[PDB]
Amino acid sequence: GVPGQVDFYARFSPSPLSMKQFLDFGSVNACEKTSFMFLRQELPVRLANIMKEISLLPDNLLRTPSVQLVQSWYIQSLQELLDFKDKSAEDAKAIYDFTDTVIRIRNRHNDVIPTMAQGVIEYKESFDPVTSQNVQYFLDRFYMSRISIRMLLNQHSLLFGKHIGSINPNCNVLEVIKDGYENARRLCDLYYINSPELELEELNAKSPGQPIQVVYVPSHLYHMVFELFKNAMRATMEHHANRGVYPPIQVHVTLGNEDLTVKMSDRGGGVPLRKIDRLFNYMYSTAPRPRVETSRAVPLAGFGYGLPISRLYAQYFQGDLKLYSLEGYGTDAVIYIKALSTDSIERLPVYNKAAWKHYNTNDDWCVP
Amino acid sequence: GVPGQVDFYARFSPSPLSMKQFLDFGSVNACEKTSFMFLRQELPVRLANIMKEISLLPDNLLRTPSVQLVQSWYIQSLQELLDFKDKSAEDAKAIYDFTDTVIRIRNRHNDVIPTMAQGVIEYKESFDPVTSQNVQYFLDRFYMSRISIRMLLNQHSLLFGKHIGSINPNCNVLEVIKDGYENARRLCDLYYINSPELELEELNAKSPGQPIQVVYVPSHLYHMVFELFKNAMRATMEHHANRGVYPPIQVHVTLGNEDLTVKMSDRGGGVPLRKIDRLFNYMYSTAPRPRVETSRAVPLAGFGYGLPISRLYAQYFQGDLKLYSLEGYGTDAVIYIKALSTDSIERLPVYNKAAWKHYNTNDDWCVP
C-alpha cells in the first residue's frame, strides 16, 4: 500500500552525484544495467522523500485540484518504479521495460512546475502568514527535488531511449548568454515596444584570451540568464519610460580558478533592501496566468516563479544566484557556477526529523 | 552579590531607541534627569545581558587574561551604576554623581574592542571547530552590544558632561567618504609605495542634484568606509603588483526613498564565493598585532576585526554591509543605511532561552 511504500523509501536519504560522475558514467559505453540498478532505488527514494513533505502542506493547499493532481502523478510514478525492485539486472526484458517506464514518467511529469504553481494560485485565491513560511520552505525543496528528479529521468532517457545526456562537456557560456538575451529581447520589444542593448565582456582569468567553457547543463544556464534578462529589461523599461532612452544591460563573465561568474547589471531604478527578497518569495510572486484569449503581449514578470527557480538551478550544483540593488539607481544580479565538475554536486533536500520539525516549529535579538 | 545583580538585570530585555528618538531627546534642552531615569535601568540591563553570554564562552577563552580584564570592567561598571537605583530623580547631587560615573565608565571601556580581540589571540595561540561557531556567535553579539553601550555613554557624556551628542542631523556623506579614502590612501602609500585613485559619483534620487545628507553618527560611517577602502586597496595593490598600473577604486553613492547606499568597487582579483565569508569570521581573521618596535609599515589587513565590526555598525541601525566578489576580476562592497531616522532602530542582542540554546545546541539537506 502507498503509505507503506512511501514510508519505506523516505527513510533513505537521496544520494547526490557530481557533474563529473554524471559525465564519466555516460561518456563511454554508458551501461543501461548499471543505470537501472541505481535508479530503481534512487528514483523511489527521491520521490518518497518529497511526497512526505507534500503531506505536510497546509490542508487548504494540499486539497487544491492542482496539488492533488501533482501528488497523484508522484504516487503513480512511485508505484510503477517499485514493480522492478524484484526483477533481475540480468533480465534484459526488465531493463527494456524499465527504460520505457522512465521515458513514460519523464512525459507524465513534464508539467509539474506550472501545475504546482497553479496549486498555489488556487490556494491563494480561495483562502495566512503562520503557514506562508511553510509554503516558502516547501516550494524551494519541492522544486529542487523536481530539478534533481528530472535530471535523472533525462540522463537515462537520453542515454538509453558530444553531449552526454543533458550535459555539454564544453558548454560555451557566452553563446548561451547571447541566446538568453535575444529571446528576452524579443519579449521586451513585444511588451514595451523597445528594449535595451547588451554590452558583454569576458575575462578568462584561469587561461587568459581563451573561450570560457564549463561542463554544464546548457538549458539550466539558459533558464537563469533568460529569467535575469527579463527581470533587468522590465526594470529598465519601467524606470526609463519618460526620458525614452534605455541604458543597456551589461554582462560581465569571468572564469576564475573555482568560480564561473556571470554579473548582469541594469539601470532599472533598483529596489530597497527591505523588499529585494520578495523577488524570491513564491507567495509574493504568485500571480494568475494571463488568459490565452488575447493578442496583448505577455509581461516580463508574472506566472511561473522564474526568479526563485533560476536560483534553485544555480544552487542545484553548488552554485548560487544573488541580487544586489541600489535603490534609485539599478541592480546587479550574479550567477555563481562551480568551474570544476568535481565541485558540482547535487544539492538534494532530505526528509527526516529536521525537515518535519521545520513544518511544526515556530528570539535572541530585539525585534525592530 | 554580582551573580544576583547580573541575574536580575539580565531578565530584562534591552530597549532599542531610534535615531529619531536619540535626536529629538537631545535637540532642545536635553533633560539630564530624564536621561538618568532611563540609563540607570538601561545601562545595567545592557551590561547584564551580555555578561551572561561572556560566562558561556569556552573555558579556555573566558580564562584568558584579556577576557578576564574585560569581564572585570563590566562587573565594576555594573556595580557602580547600581549604587543609583535607590537615589531620587529629584536629588541634584545624585544626577551630578551619575553623570560623573557615566563619563568615568566611558573612559574605563575605551579599549574594550582590542582587549577582547587580544583575548581571542591569547586563546587561539595556546589552544576547535565545535566551539568556533560559539565564538563567532558571541563576538557579533558582544561587539554589537558594546557599540550600543558606547552609543548611550557617548550621548549622555556629550550632552551633559549642530551635533546632538554623537549624531550629526545633516551628515555630509560624500565628505566622510573622502575623509575615509584619504586616510586609507595614506596607509596604502606607506605599505605598497603606491595607491589607487578614487572615482566618486553620486545620485540623489529622492531630490536630484541636491547634497546627500542623512541623520547619522559620522564616526560610524567613517569606520565602515575607511575599513572598506583598506580592503579594496589591499586587493588592488596585491593583484596588480606585476603590471604596476592600479585601477582606481570606484564609489557610487545613491540616496533613494528608503536606502542610502554606498557601493565600492575594486579590480583586486576577487575571492571565490566559498571563501568570501572568511572576511567576516573572527577566528579566521585573528592575527597577532605587529610589534611596536619597528618602522616597517603596518599592513592594510590584520589585527582588530575591521571588516566584521564595520558590518555590525551598518546593522546596528538596521542597515547592512554586503560583499559580492567575482573571482579573477574584483569585488563590490555595499553599505546600506536607512535614509529615514525613524527607520534607524538599534539592533540589540538579548539574553534569554534562545541565546542560551544557541551556545548549547549542535539536517534537512544533503551534506556536500
Ligand SMILES: CN(C)C(=O)c1ccc(S(=O)(=O)c2ccc(NC(=O)[C@@](C)(O)C(F)(F)F)c(Cl)c2)cc1
Ligand atoms: C567507467 N565508468 C562507468 C565510471 O567511471 C563511473 C562508474 C560509476 C560512477 S558512479 O558515481 O557510481 C555513477 C554515476 C552516474 C550513474 N548513473 C547515471 O548517471 C544515470 C544515467 O543513471 C542517471 F540517471 F543520471 F543517474 C551511476 Cl548508475 C553511477 C561514475 C563513473
Ligand SMILES: CN(C)C(=O)c1ccc(S(=O)(=O)c2ccc(NC(=O)[C@@](C)(O)C(F)(F)F)c(Cl)c2)cc1
Ligand atoms: C521633547 N522630547 C524630549 C521628546 O520629544 C522625546 C522624549 C522622549 C523620547 S524617548 O524615546 O522616550 C527617549 C529618547 C532618548 C533618551 N535618552 C537619551 O537619548 C540618552 C541621552 O539618555 C541616551 F543615553 F542616549 F540614551 C530618553 Cl531618556 C528617552 C524621545 C523624544
Ligand SMILES: [K+]
Ligand atoms: K530520508
Ligand SMILES: [K+]
Ligand atoms: K534578557
